[PDB]
Every structure is written in C-alpha cells, then in structure tokens.
Amino acid sequence: AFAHFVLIHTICHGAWIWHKLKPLLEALGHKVTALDLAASGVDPRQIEEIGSFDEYSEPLLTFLEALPPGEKVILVGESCGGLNIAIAADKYCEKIAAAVFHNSVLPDTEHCPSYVVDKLMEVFPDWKDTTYFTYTKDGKEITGLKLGFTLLRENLYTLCGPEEYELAKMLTRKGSLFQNILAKRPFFTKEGYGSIKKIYVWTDQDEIFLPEFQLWQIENYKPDKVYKVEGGDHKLQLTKTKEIAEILQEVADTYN
Amino acid sequence: AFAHFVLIHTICHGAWIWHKLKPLLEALGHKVTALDLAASGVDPRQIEEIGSFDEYSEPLLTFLEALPPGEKVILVGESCGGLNIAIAADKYCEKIAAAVFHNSVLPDTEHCPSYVVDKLMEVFPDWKDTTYFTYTKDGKEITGLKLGFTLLRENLYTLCGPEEYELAKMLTRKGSLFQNILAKRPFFTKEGYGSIKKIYVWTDQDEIFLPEFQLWQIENYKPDKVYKVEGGDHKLQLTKTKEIAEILQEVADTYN
C-alpha cells in the first residue's frame, strides 16, 4: 500500500533532516510532506516570536487543515516532534491513520504535557556546549537554546558522516522546548491523541535519548507496536534510512 | 600551505551547498567560512527587503570587515557568487589573496556590472518551471525568482544524488539577480576588483552555464589561471568535491 507520510523534525532542526528518507519513501510510491515548523529551517519567523509548543506547531496544523475530507496521513516525528504529534492529534485526530515516533518523546494523557520532557532532563541533564537564553512572549519567560556543536557531533549525529554533521552546523537554529509552557498546558486528550495508533521506533545506541529514557517511555504509555532498529544513532533517518523506510512501509500496510 | 577559504553560494541558495566541500577542505588543514548572504539559507531577511546586489552581499562585506589587519582570504564563488566577489573586492581588496570562480559569472571592469548576466540570459533564455514576481524597493521594481524544480533537477543538479536534489528542493528560496539594478550600478573598479588574482574553474558538462557562455567569459576577461574539471555538473562542489578541494589546495599554495 501507499500512504501520505508527514515528516516532523525536532526543535532546532528543519525539514532538511529528512533529505535522505523522503526520496526513499517516494521510491516506494508514497507521498511525502516534510514541513518546517515555526521559526525552523527556512520558516521566516524567529523563535522569540513563538510563545508555546502549540504556536510552534502551526505549520503542521495548517497543513492538516488543508487536507480534503477523507484524506488521512501517517505522522512521523523525531525527538521532540512527538509533542507536535500530540498537539496535532487533539485537533485533527480523524485525519491521522497512525503516528510513528522516531527516537521521539512519547507524551501521554494521564500526566501533564511536560511529563516526558521533565524525565528526559533527569536522564540527560548535561547538554555540553549548548547555550541558553531567555525571552518573553505573552507575558511568560521562555528558555531558548542553541544546540552545541560538540553535543551535535557526539550525541545527536554520533555515526553520521561529516557532510551530514556539517549540514547540522550550518542549519540548526535557536529554538525552545517551551518546557514551562507545556507544564501549564491542558492535558492531551484521551479522545483525540489517546485514540490514535502509536508506533514507537528506536535504537538502543541513541546517545541522547538513552535506553533508560526510551524504555521508560514505552513502559509509561504502551505503544501499539514497537520497532527496535539495531545500530545507528539518534538520527536514524540518516544512519539507518533504509531500515526506517522498511518500517514505514510496514506501518502503511498495517494502519489506514 | 593552509588558507582561509570563504565560500559564497549563488542566488536562491545558502551555505548548505558547501556541506560536502567544507569538511574536505578542513581535512586538508584549512580554515573555512561558508556564509549565508542576505535573505539566503537561514538568514532572517526575506528577499523583498533587499534592494541591490550590494545589499545582498552585506554578510560577506561584514565578514571581511571583521578580519583583523593582515589576514587574507581566498574567496570561492559559485554561479552568481562572482558578482558578490567583485563587490567585495571593491571594498576589501587588501584582504583578498585570490578569488576562485566556480562555474561562476566573471564580471569585468570595462563593461557595466550587468554585462555578463545580460549575456547569460541570451545563452540560456529558458528557465523552465522557474517562477517570477516583482517587488518594489528603494523606488525600483525588482524581479524576484524561485528556481523551478525541473530546472533544478535537469540543469543545476543534473548528476547529483537524489538526497542532494532533495536538499535543494527543501532549502532553495526566493531570490533575485537584481539585473536592472546592476545595469545602473557604477562599474567595478580596476584598482580594487581588477587587481585581484582570478582563478576560473569550470566543467564543459554544465547544463546551465553552457560552454558557449563560460568560454565567452574566459575570452572576455582573461583569468590568471583556468582549471577545467572533467565530468560532473553545475554543482561541482557536490559532484566533483575532491577535485575542487585539490584545485583549491593548489590555489592556496600559489597565491597568498
């Protein structure tokens, strides 16, 4: 079967992270959309204009709004993109055939929206040469970050080739987790986000979303299906592109 | 010898085009700066804010201004980046050890600044699925363009791999040649631009800067040295990365 995959990058990244996966999925016959979220990639906004994870998600929500009735998509989110998935599913659940989490945060419906982010920060507290700043938007102080190049090299892009790491140095931008805004946000709903099919893809060789964290997430909120990819790194769409495409094909053949 | 190379992308592109070449040059021991010009790559400006090729060049001029006395660089410009080189050399000639033209426009000092652009448009008049628009800035109507995906695939990225073409689809932005603004600009100066050493690198397999055009440029304004790279495509920094690095090493060993 063919599907329409919507690929969702993490904070400080953009659609460009999907540049290997997108053509491979198209060579299987799928439709693929790879979005820039607000203030990401080549989106014209700067992060200081953005006040919440929900505002950050606007390009995904606008895209979903534009789907004609009856058209469903498979969302694929890397790293913090699982939060974009949960936000999207609470507005457009009927348009989502399934969600695939790709070394991603896996929010739940029983705890506040920041819950898995709070946990991540306990498991991985030292972001190396990452820099931080604060800005104010909608009367709240937001912590912005710019991912450190050593962190990128050692922990996110560990096994990626030098030309891929170079792209990350060139293209990663200031972003935010909006952690304190998530902490005050209404919970993700059981009827919306809770109802979608959830496929969790990971590697135990991820050097930032460590096995303790990922296995904690799986136990916390049981996925419909789990795929463990052997080897690679945090950026499986770069280091294990073919394996990710094969998994996504199986998801397309399972959920519609 | 080691040099400091400053890599200068073409219109509608960004530093990302250099993502393969930059690490290779660093693996030879060089310093490398790959800039985003105004309204390019992840620069925060949109093209409609930019009124001339000189304003477009601001990040290159600001970078050169920031070099301490005595530090020289080798400029490397692809495609329309030769115009950025000429602009830069008329402000900071003393900071430029040499300029390398990489399937690039080669402006001169005897004709107005638009001269080689005007010629290019005669040799290659049909930009396929490229779209055009107009905006007004500083009381002049400027023609903007967005490079067509078929043009990108067939003429710029002809032999590049699908993952490279994907990056171009994702990251190329609206830009402008500022052709009518160039036509009215004061000529490039003999003392400044005319005095720098100029190395012309090309392939006769370029499907946009065709051999008639490139050989016309070489005859029009004799380079100090010409290197012809066999094979590849317009994006030699993607298809012939190693060959380009070897040429640049020789330039670093010749001009300081």
Swiss-Prot record, chains A, B:
Record annotation: effect of changing C80S: Greatly reduced catalytic activity
Keywords: Lyase
Biophysicochemical property: pH dependence: Optimum pH is between 5.3 and 5.7.
Cross-referenced Pfam families: Abhydrolase_1
Reported impact of H9A: Almost no change in catalytic activity in crude extracts, but the purified mutant protein is inactive
Gene Ontology biological-process annotations: jasmonic acid metabolic process; salicylic acid metabolic process
Uses, biotech or industry: This enzyme can be used as a biocatalyst for stereoselective synthesis of a wide array of (S)-cyanohydrins by addition of HCN to aldehydes or ketones. Optically active cyanohydrins are interesting intermediates for the synthesis of alpha-hydroxy acids, alpha-hydroxy ketones, or beta-ethanolamines, all of which are important building blocks in organic synthesis.
UniProt entry tagged with the keyword Lyase: yes
Family from the record: Belongs to the AB hydrolase superfamily. Hydroxynitrile lyase family.
Name of the protein described by the UniProt record: (S)-hydroxynitrile lyase
Source organism per UniProt: Hevea brasiliensis (Para rubber tree)
Gene name for this UniProt entry: HNL
